[PDB]
Symmetry: C2
Subunit: 226 residues, 2 copies
């Protein structure tokens, strides 16, 4: 698959998931149940989850190491919401055009190369990069291009590349569907499965498996034992 | 009590807590263990907790109602960090706070509006260039909308300040503290105690976690 094909595939997956979650024409700003959609708030709330994957608190668990497994999950959650904002921001949707525009972001090319492992000395800078995303998404707006650039730069610093993002995205997209199919809206969903959060179980599954439908089935099996 | 006394007391309690937690001269930006302090980050992270006290998500638990108990706790957590910024004597600081026009009103629904005020605080705490005075006004405007007044802030602040000391005395720093006590977050147990010396209750309660 070309870089643009990978991006088109994620956009198409995001569209389908949003359509199923929110109803058609969620792009107009509300779900079918009348709830306001704020993709920017979604993003800065995942940014808070991302920050909490690091030992940023000066008063709590100060010798603990970075949770890099969760870092990757939160980077992927952010991406779901950025894809959503791309689709919202814009009858006939041209996914290839959108993909082509994302592909032209200067740092995207760098994102497509092999990932580098981060280390403790990178955390200060990573936290400041996340803070910039929070700032951009909490104001008036807002520039979608600067957001993409800042996002890919952050994702590189966090040890992701397009490959890791894509494969993890697919898995989380499946879990997102699973959640909606199992009581996420009405509060009946159990997010902890025999002591592990669903994201952690998904990560275990992803160590082996990439196939969309196989992932769903495996989630189903594990959730029976939740 | 007068408003100035209430403010001075909070500022005094904050200094004590920060001294005990971080060591003397935390005002220079580092803890005794050499960790960099960012009060603004502390604030926007509590803002996230505050947002999460409302049914903001369009895709999850969409019929749930606001957790006003937790709203009060997060408004109080934000206040600890604002006091820390103010401090980063007490009479003069209290005098400035008391002069904030919205503060006077504070001494006396619309969830998406509340959320927008929280968002403004997040925005102000995450940019390059910061104004503490403007944050104060936004904060008290929000706290009114959340149903607090000075009395509620002050009484809840005292209680959480006690929990904060308790935490530090019981392994918060080294990861041995249990933050969930027999199925309830420590903040929820605190809230139950505050319906009703606080430190002794916490210590007794902590025994069965
Ligand atoms: O309209 C929506 C709403 C949610 N999500 C997904 C994206 C993200 O992957 C996830 C975040 O769900 P959450 O409820 O914040 N839980 P967690 O952050 O632990 O995944 O929800 C969408 O893709 N579209
Ligand atoms: O230097 C510090 C560090 C922390 N805190 C307090 C303020 C706040 O009340 C609490 C927040 O701690 P937390 O670990 O974020 N946990 P929670 O938000 O659940 O109370 O910590 C201070 O007062 N000073
Ligand atoms: Mg989330
Ligand atoms: Mg998370
Ligand atoms: Mg997340
Ligand atoms: Mg907190
Ligand atoms: Mg909280
Ligand atoms: Mg809090």
């Amino acid at each position: 698959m070309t870089n643009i094909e990978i991006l088109e595939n994620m956009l198409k997956l995001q569209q389908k998931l949003n359509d199923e979650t929110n109803g058609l024409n969620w792009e107009n700003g509300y779900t079918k149940e009348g709830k306001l959609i704020s993709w920017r708030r979604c993003i800065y709330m995942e940014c808070a989850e991302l920050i909490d994957s690091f030992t940023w608190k000066h008063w709590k668990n100060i010798s603990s190491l970075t949770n890099w497994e969760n870092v990757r999950i939160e980077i992927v959650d952010i991406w779901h919401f950025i894809l959503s904002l791309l689709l919202e921001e814009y009858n006939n949707k041209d996914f290839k055009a959108i993909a082509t525009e994302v592909n032209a972001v200067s740092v995207f090319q760098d994102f497509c190369k092999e990932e580098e492992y981060p280390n403790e000395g990178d955390i200060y800078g990573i936290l400041n990069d996340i803070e910039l995303i929070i700032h951009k998404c909490s104001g008036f707006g807002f520039n979608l291009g600067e957001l993409l650039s800042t996002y890919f730069t952050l994702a590189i610093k966090c040890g992701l590349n397009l490959e890791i993002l894509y494969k993890t995205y697919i898995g989380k997209n499946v879990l997102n569907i699973f959640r909606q199919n199992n009581g996420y809206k009405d509060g009946s969903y159990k997010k902890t499965w025999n002591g592990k959060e669903d994201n952690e179980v998904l990560a275990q599954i992803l160590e082996q498996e990439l196939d969309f439908d196989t992932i769903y089935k495996k989630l189903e099996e594990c959730y029976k034992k939740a």
